[PDB]
Amino acid sequence: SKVSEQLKCCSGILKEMFAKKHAAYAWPFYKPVDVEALGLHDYCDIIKHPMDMSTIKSKLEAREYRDAQEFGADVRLMFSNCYKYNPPDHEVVAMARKLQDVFEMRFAKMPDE
Numbered sequence: 034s035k036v037s038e039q040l041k042c043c044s045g046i047l048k049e050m051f052a053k054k055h056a057a058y059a060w061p062f063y064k065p066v067d068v069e070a071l072g073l074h075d076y077c078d079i080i081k082h083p084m085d086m087s088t089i090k091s092k093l094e095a096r097e098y099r100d101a102q103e104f105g106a107d108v109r110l111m112f113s114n115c116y117k118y119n120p121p122d123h124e125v126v127a128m129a130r131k132l133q134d135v136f137e138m139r140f141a142k143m144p145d146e
């Protein structure tokens with residue numbers, strides 16, 4: 034099915050996002066932001082739907098995403114939360130932009146038929 038194939042591409046993109054070659058900028062997105070350990074007392078107030086790569090991985094496996102668009106929405110939610118909460122000069126934002134570039138360039142090759 035077109036959907037099965039799209040999901041495989043999504044699985045491949047997320048696997049690449051976890052790969053050692055991208056770890057220097059991907060690592061802060063591997064798991065949910067630990068608001069307690071980082072002392073981000075206002076994070077929950079500011080961000081309504083936290084998202085991270087391990088959460089996306091778990092959702093893909095459980096077959097939560099019906100298609101590439103649903104999967105893409107959660108990847109873009111992860112980056113948007115970073116752009117929303119952090120000051121634009123924060124290092125983590127620079128890292129988000131590098132990981133988003135890897136994501137967008139490969140997600141743009143999604144099979145179209």
Ligand SMILES: Cn1cc(-c2cc(NS(=O)(=O)CC(F)(F)F)c3ccn(C(C)(c4ccccn4)c4ccccn4)c3c2)cc(NC(=O)Nc2ccccc2F)c1=O
Pocket residue numbers: 060061062063064065066067068071114115118119120123124125128
């Ligand atoms: C998506 N996301 C993720 C994180 C984040 C998560 C971590 N680990 S984790 O367990 O949570 C998730 C996991 F496992 F995947 F890695 C660590 C461990 C160390 N750090 C540093 C040293 C740091 C600095 C620069 C670049 C990268 N890492 C750190 C320490 C203190 C304060 C900031 N940064 C982390 C940062 C923070 C956000 N935002 C943010 O830290 N904002 C902020 C902090 C202080 C002042 C102003 C701010 F805007 C955010 O969005």
